[PDB]
Design a protein around this ligand. Sequence first.
Ligand code: AR6
Length: 162
Amino acid sequence: HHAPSYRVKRMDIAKNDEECVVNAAAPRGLPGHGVCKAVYKKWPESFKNSATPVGTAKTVMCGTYPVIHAVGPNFSNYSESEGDRELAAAYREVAKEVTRLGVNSVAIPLLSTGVYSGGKDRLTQSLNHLFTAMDSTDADVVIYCRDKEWEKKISEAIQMRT
Ligand SMILES: Nc1ncnc2c1ncn2[C@@H]1O[C@H](COP(=O)(O)OP(=O)(O)OC[C@H]2O[C@H](O)[C@H](O)[C@@H]2O)[C@@H](O)[C@H]1O
């Protein structure tokens, strides 16, 4: 009867201590910048047939270590309304994969808040879709970020639900 938790760490998600990692991926499975750059360097064999549509997630093992490639929408291409819908869906597919895998913990970034943000601050939008998807899972969730201001805000949001 463990107590599932949420935690935030400001560090490279490729150095995570969890049983699986979520990549903020691209639909064509191509190595990119940001999270996907780190994931490619650490777990390159997980990019075999990782391409998957926007709003979906696809898991590929690197050894026995699962890499969940989740494809958030690029807000430069989507309307705010359609993009918000795809971002919610991507996180829902992450939650299903985490559950299917049976892991006790997952390392997860904030999808569509960097290269795919359309130039907007989407910290709150993306974190809330994360919570909406993962709340009903019983995995320990650890959110990885790089920005000191964002660590604080993510940590505040976690605190004020406990
Ligand atoms: N190694 C890292 N660890 C933790 N957080 C990171 C890391 N790197 C960046 N962040 C932050 O994690 C957050 C997500 O930023 P992004 O990785 O761009 O994801 P997206 O969904 O918006 O863009 C995906 C596209 O860009 C890629 O090229 C893909 O291949 C795709 O083509 C930001 O706040 C980062 O500051």
